Amino acid sequence: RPVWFICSGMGAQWQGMGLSLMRLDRFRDSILRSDQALKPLGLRVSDLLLSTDEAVLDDIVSSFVSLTSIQIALIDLLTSLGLQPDGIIGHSLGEVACGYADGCLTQEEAVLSSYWRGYCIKEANVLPGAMAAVGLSWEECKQRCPPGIVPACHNSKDTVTISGPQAAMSEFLQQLKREDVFVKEVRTGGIAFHSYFMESIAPTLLRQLRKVILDPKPRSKRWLSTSIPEAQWQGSLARTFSAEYSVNNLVSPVLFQEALQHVPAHAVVVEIAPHALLQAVLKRSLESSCTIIPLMKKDHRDNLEFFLSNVGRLHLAGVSVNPNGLFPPVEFPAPRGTPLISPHIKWDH
Structure with a gap:
């Protein structure tokens, strides 16, 4: 069986993220190395994880750092198990972590990327946005969406995350529930990611991520991008994890289902994230012949047991x-x- 690393993105947070797993030495020790990159900026991820409250699940700079710093640690545990990936796929802010797993990104360059990606966004005071996963074909969206409500994420063959105007969501879902459509909101701390909203930020971000990522490393064919159409995979932009790429990821639509297409048939898919958001999607949008495995369940009494539970499952998988x-x-x-x-x-x- 091939192993496929899937890296869930935003909305995937919650108070008490891997406080249980801090015990495990391989984990903690990696979360500390994430502090080592975040220290010159006066920030400690391990505090963000443990002084956690509502506002820091909503603070977008804490989140990009929290998620990425955890994902990067989950990935580390997976490499201690002695399990390297055959395929790699990122979903939004996840890609960052992915570029770590493919090995185009240093833990530092990775962490500080997330940090700035999140900072420049927060400081652009961008207008009240909000996302939601909604269950209609990508083309059904382009047809039935109020103006100014983009289709942003292509998750399954029939599940897509629309991005847009905070107040135009609230009254366009009051309106969708009343026709029995799949609708679960994603926590975005108010910002419409992967829409036109982001163009305003692109300049200042690109100009800055260019100082974090010199120099850029080649990506491997093992890593399927979800930020660049499969068309232009042999391109100049697609070829390396550069600032230019990091920025594009925040601006363009995440083509998830597209990458899931390339996933073989006896494949084992692990969701590498502080919470199994894309379990719905992956199981829906992939073969019944594929086993799908979370790594952490949000609000679980003791993630350390739930992770071993699933380390166990990764075995039953084969x-x-x-x-x-x-x-x-x-x-x-x-x-x-x-x-x-x-x-x-x-x-x-």
């Missing part, structure tokens, strides 16, 4: 993962009087 890489090495030789094994290896006799 993938090659080994938990001993999460916890400190064992001191071989084993103690004397440590339970026999052969008598418990039962066969099909």
